[PDB]
Design a protein around this nucleic acid. Structure first.
Lengths: 629, 18, 70, 55
RNA sequence: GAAACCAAAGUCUUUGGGUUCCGGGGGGAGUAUGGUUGCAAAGCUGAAACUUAAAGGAAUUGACGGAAGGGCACCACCAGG
RNA sequence: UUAAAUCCUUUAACGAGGAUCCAUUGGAGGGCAAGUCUGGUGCCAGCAGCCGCGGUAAUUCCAGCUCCAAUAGCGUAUAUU
């Protein structure tokens, strides 16, 4: 580099550029031009009483909103020159906290001085960690109601307890209004953690929801949801997804007066009929004597518990032996395994990705090149500006068709968060996620068992398929969700552009949602082959040199002739091939590369391609608050 | 009639062009 | 890609299944691998190893002591 | 092609650790190490056995 | 002395007669660049990134010779049955 | 005690039978101390500073048991001696 003064000039130039980027990023939030800074308050312990924390944190000017159960306000202070919108959510109530944690810019956790948190706080915190953490801050409540000799030890015990989830984070006190002002100063000046899924879509938190029914007997009508645009520029032609009730097109946007400016009616756009995106979930267009034989004719309540125990023994059997299936002797093996074939190698042997497709694949969409399309769409998001409403503007959305029940939920206390999608995000295809199993639950999960998916601002029920997470073209089906592996879950769902946080829940009992798997979204394609393996075992009971007579793998003579081409392998490392059947029963001669032990077992691998089951429905039951048994 | 099949090419999903 | 200078490096993820704890565009702490800028063992042209992923250690993730945010 | 991750670790059956009596620590552990190596010594003609020698 | 060997390649862990040049694992490479000399060809001076667990020096046996000599055999030939 | 405290010290009262008031971090082929143990995997996953291990009896991977070193400490990266 040389020339000390020129090196210092280069360092000054880099300092100036990085500082300009930093100031450009920081000014967009909680200011005169940007949207309000949204904070979500989660009291992790049941001993923590949320209302006095909110009242102490309440006092600039306060504008209190009111809902059915939850009570949130909006704070406005020119001393910090900063605008806040505070909300509160109870842990365990996964619907509310998980559904408006994806819109808040900062999560404020409240902590018990004595214990770290509850089990419900841990459950909510696991869901928050896997769903995507915004900027977070830790605060504590009951420290100043204790003597000093217990106070110092209590803070040390808290510091020991928090390190297991939050390694090195400072704890702030909420005891005095001066501490509250210090905490608002801390929240106003943070390094912001940015979630990519929020930043690529155009999301909005509904501040006020109005409804005008088209026909009260039809129970549908126009919704007027008003709030601040926070993500990208909000364009009318894109569809709008309301997170609990599905995706549908919107009619009009107007910009009324921003009611609460930092320092103190006209319609913006209607949707053209041609430029609007269409509501298209799937593809629209669909001489023998009398007594002689053939041998000589050629010469001429507790039932659920029993199901749980058999599931346990099936999971235990499928862990000791990967895909071992006993052949039925009542029906023929070539009929029961009619759709199965043998692969010489799982890696190199070809398989046509379009060989035998179900009728469900005639109802989904594919991508000619998903990577290039994703990059192109993201470039028109970032590098190109649309004619919509800019971020931070208080607008009102007139959306066309929505049931009345949504409005009822907005009067219950449940928040409404609506985000406008990317192009090609309503159409359904085969989603592939990579997930790993949460240590909290150990219930066995079958491959095609119904689960609840939180996949990038969407919630839906589906029956997946679990596969090896491998870089090859074929992937072996996993008949169970294992605790330690990273697996691929395959579903039918509307397509999402990665990255996206993915949660898998199981409806346990009494309306309770139990988190079973956490992960993210891998590439979307229906050409990802999932291969189910069936392993058939036989006992070599007459052993000679390099060839043996093996039984119990088959029970007919022509089953041996049907599965003759498939190469056999061995638990002790031998590789062989069927030579001849001898008996009318399933006895066969098999050649091998070496000599077999008496304690040995021959086995054959059969393969089929399996597709997921179309059990998609966007409706998800509202959870009851979580508790431990 | 052992490990032989026809397996015709049918009902492909509609692909989105780039 | 390192944050402070923009240079591109290749870092080895040691234990089995530990690459599954890594996603794309993730914040990762990297150290050298042990031979002071020299490549080690079988791996051609790798001088670095991943120490921490998303500000939690790969050791605690592998042994299952902690959970990873995203 | 190939490139599985965590294949064997996810394959191996999970065997739980048995519950055993705790080990002594500190001066007591050094006392037990001393009494095992230098006090109750068994004479051997060639001394070809280790402490972890099995079979 | 590592030895092949060497009256020097000796008088060296019992290590100091005087003094010049000059090496520091193998490659990149005596290459790039700069300087200088030359009509030119080129000469002199002379790196780094990167790569590698070796490269090398003396000796010591001799699988194997498409290396050479001999001998033996109707499970080899010649003359035949 | 001290500006007032806290801590240390001094002291009433309570506070110990192994399922506790439960000690970890690395390793067990060689260098380099301590297993040719058992199960799983099968040149894969991986281990391995170096030499190497893994392609079906793996003393080296992943585990269980056992053992070894230091021990309220012990690993790893880097600068340096």
């Amino acid at each position: 580099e040389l020339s000390r003064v020129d090196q210092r000039h280069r360092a000054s130039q880099l300092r100036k550029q990085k500082k300009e980027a930093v100031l450009a990023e920081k000014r967009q939030l909680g200011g005169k031009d940007g949207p309000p800074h949204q904070v979500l308050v989660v009291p992790l312990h049941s001993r923590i009483s949320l209302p006095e924390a909110m009242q102490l944190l309440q006092d600039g000017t306060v504008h209190l909103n009111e809902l059915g159960n939850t009570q949130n306000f909006m704070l406005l202070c020119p001393r910090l020159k900063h605008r806040w919108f505070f909300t509160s959510a109870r842990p365990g109530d996964l619907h509310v906290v998980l559904d408006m944690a994806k819109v808040a810019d900062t999560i404020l956790f409240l902590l018990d001085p004595l214990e770290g948190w509850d089990s419900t706080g841990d459950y909510c915190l696991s869901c928050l960690f896997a769903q995507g953490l915004p900027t977070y801050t830790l605060a504590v409540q009951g420290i100043s109601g204790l003597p000093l000799k217990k106070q110092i030890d209590t803070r040390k015990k808290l510091s020991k307890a928090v390190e297991k989830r939050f390694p090195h984070d400072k704890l702030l006190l909420l005891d005095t209004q001066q501490e509250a002002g210090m905490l608002l100063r801390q929240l106003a000046n943070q390094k912001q953690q940015h979630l990519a899924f929020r930043d690529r879509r155009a999301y909005l938190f509904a501040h006020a929801v109005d409804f005008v029914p088209s026909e009260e007997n039809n129970l549908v009508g126009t919704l007027k949801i008003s709030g601040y645009v926070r993500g990208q520029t909000l364009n009318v032609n894109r569809l709008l997804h309301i997170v609990g009730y599905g995706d549908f097109q919107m009619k009009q946007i107007d910009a009324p007066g921003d009611p609460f400016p930092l320092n103190p009616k006209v319609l913006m756009k209607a949707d053209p009929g041609r430029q609007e995106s269409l509501q298209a979930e799937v593809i629209p267009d669909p001489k023998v004597p009398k007594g002689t034989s053939s041998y000589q004719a050629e010469w001429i309540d507790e039932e659920a518990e029993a199901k749980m125990l058999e599931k346990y023994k099936q999971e235990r059997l499928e862990e000791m032996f990967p895909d071992e299936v006993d052949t039925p002797r009542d029906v023929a093996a070539r009929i029961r395994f009619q759709k199965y074939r043998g692969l010489k190698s799982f890696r190199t042997s070809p398989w046509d990705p379009k060989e035998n497709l179900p009728q469900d694949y005639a109802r989904i969409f594919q991508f000619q090149n998903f990577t290039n399309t994703r990059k192109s769409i993201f470039k028109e998001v970032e590098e190109k500006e649309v004619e919509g409403a800019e971020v931070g503007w208080y607008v009102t959305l007139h959306v066309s068709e929505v049931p009345v029940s949504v409005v009822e939920c907005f009067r219950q206390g449940t928040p409404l968060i609506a985000f406008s999608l990317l192009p090609h995000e309503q159409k359904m295809s085969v989603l592939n996620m990579v997930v790993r199993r949460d240590p909290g639950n150990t219930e066995p999960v079958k491959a095609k068992e119904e689960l609840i998916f939180h996949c990038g601002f969407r919630r839906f029920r589906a029956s997946p398929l679990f596969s090896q997470h491998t870089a090859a073209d074929k992937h072996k089906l996993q008949r169970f969700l294992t605790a330690d592996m990273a697996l691929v879950a395959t579903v039918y769902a509307p397509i999402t552009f990665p990255p996206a946080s993915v949660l898998l829940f199981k409806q346990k009992s009494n309306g309770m949602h139990s988190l079973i798997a956490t992960g993210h979204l891998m590439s979307v394609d229906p050409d990802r082959m999932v291969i189910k393996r069936v392993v058939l075992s036989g006992h070599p009971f007459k052993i000679f040199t390099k060839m043996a007579v093996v039984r119990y793998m088959f029970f007919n003579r022509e089953d041996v002739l049907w599965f003759k081409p498939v190469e056999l392998r061995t638990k002790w490392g031998r590789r062989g091939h069927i030579k001849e059947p001898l008996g009318t029963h399933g006895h066969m001669k098999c050649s091998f590369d070496g000599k077999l032990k008496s304690q040995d077992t021959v086995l054959m691998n059969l393969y089929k391609r399996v597709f997921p089951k179309w059990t998609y429905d966007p409706y998800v039951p509202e959870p009851v608050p979580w508790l431990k048994s | 009639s052992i490990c032989s099949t026809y397996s015709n090419l049918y009902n492909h999903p509609q692909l989105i062009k780039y | 890609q390192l944050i402070k200078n923009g240079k591109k490096i290749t870092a080895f993820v040691p234990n089995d299944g530990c690459l599954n704890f890594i996603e794309e565009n993730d914040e990762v702490l990297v150290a050298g691998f042990g031979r002071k800028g020299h490549a080690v063992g079988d791996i051609p042209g790798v001088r670095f190893k991943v120490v921490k992923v998303a500000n939690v250690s790969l050791l605690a993730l592998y042994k299952g002591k902690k959970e990873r945010p995203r | 092609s190939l490139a599985r991750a965590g294949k064997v670790r996810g394959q191996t059956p999970k065997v739980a650790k048995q519950e055993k009596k705790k080990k002594k620590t500190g001066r007591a552990k050094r006392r037990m190490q001393y009494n095992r190596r230098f006090v109750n010594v068994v004479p051997t003609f060639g001394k070809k056995k280790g402490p972890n020698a099995n079979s």
